[PDB]
C-alpha cells in the first residue's frame, strides 16, 4: 500500500483527472512522488527551460543577451502582451527571455526558439543536461493541444524537477546565468494561485506556470527557499480525459501543500 499517495489520489478523483507531483528536499534528499514519471503536457511551462537554454548559449556568444531583436508584426501571436507593447521599440534577448518567463509571452517564446534552432534545439539542450524525458516538438500555439495520449510537447514531473534543480541550484549554468534564471523565476507574475499559494508568505519562490486549458491541462513548477533550510524543488502537472474538462489552480495549490507536508 501507499498511504502517502492516498490524499493525491483523492484530490485527482475530485478533480476528474490525473495529477502528477514530484518534490525534492535538496537538504535531506527526501522526496514526495505521485505519478511522478508519467507524461504531462508542458504548455507554457517549457518557457522556463527555453530561457535557461538561451542563458547557456549566452555564455558562449558574447553580447547575446544584450542583442536587440527588431521583430516585425508577423512574429506576433495571441497572448504576447509584452512583445506587442515593445513592437515599435524592439527587445533584447534578455528582455524577450524575461517576457517568456514572467508573462508567458508567446511571440517572445517563438523568437527565442528560433534562435536555438526550434523545438528540436531546446530538446537537444535538455538532453545535454541529462534530461532524456523532455520533449518539445511544436511552436506556439500548436504545442498546447494537450491531446490525451500524444507524447508531443510533454515531460514528467520528476524530469522537470530534476532539470529545474540542475539549472537553478546545480552547475548546468555558469553562476551569473544561474542567478539570472533564478531572478526571472522569482519575478514571475502568473503563478500567484498555484505553488506560491501553498507556500508561507516569508519563503521565496521562483516558478513558471503552464495552462493548455483544454483537457484539464495546467501546471506549475518551482524552486522554494524555506527560511533557514535548503531549497525545495517541485513540479505539479494536471490533465484530464475530456476536451472540455476544466483545469484548476486550486488543485495545483492543494497538491503543492501535500508535497510540502509530506517532506522531511
Ligand atoms: C501557456 O500555457 N500559455 C500562455 C498564456 N499564459 O499562460 S500561463 O501563464 O499559464 O503560462 C495563455 C495560455 C497559454 C497558451 N495558450 O499559449
Author numbering: 26 to 289
Paper passage:
Bacterial β-lactamase enzymes are a major contributor to antibiotic resistance by hydrolyzing β-lactam antibiotics. Avibactam, which is used in combination with the β-lactam antibiotic ceftazidime, possesses a relatively broad-spectrum inhibition activity as it can inhibit class A, C, and some class D β-lactamases including extended-spectrum β-lactamases such as SHV variants. Furthermore, avibactam inhibits serine β-lactamases via a reversible mechanism which differentiates it from the currently available inhibitors. We found avibactam covalently bonded to S70 in the active site of KPC-2 and SHV-1.
